[PDB]
Write a protein that binds this ligand. Structure first.
Ligand SMILES: [Zn+2]
Ligand SMILES: [Zn+2]
Length: 45
DNA sequence: CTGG
């Protein structure tokens, strides 16, 4: 879809789809033990 | 925009 992947960089898909290795922690937030949104990725408030 |  002409989108660069969060942790792989290659386009035509998204992080999870990319064959390359996945990020251990949250992509947007970094932390570990959850998805991307669940963690303080963007001031949950 | 896209999400594990
Ligand atoms: Zn990728
Ligand atoms: Zn996080």
């Amino acid at each position: 879809k002409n989108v660069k992947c969060f942790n792989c960089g290659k386009e035509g898909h998204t992080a999870r789809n990319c064959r390359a290795p996945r990020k251990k922690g949250c992509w947007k937030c970094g932390k570990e033990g959850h998805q991307m949104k669940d963690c303080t990725e963007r001031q949950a408030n």
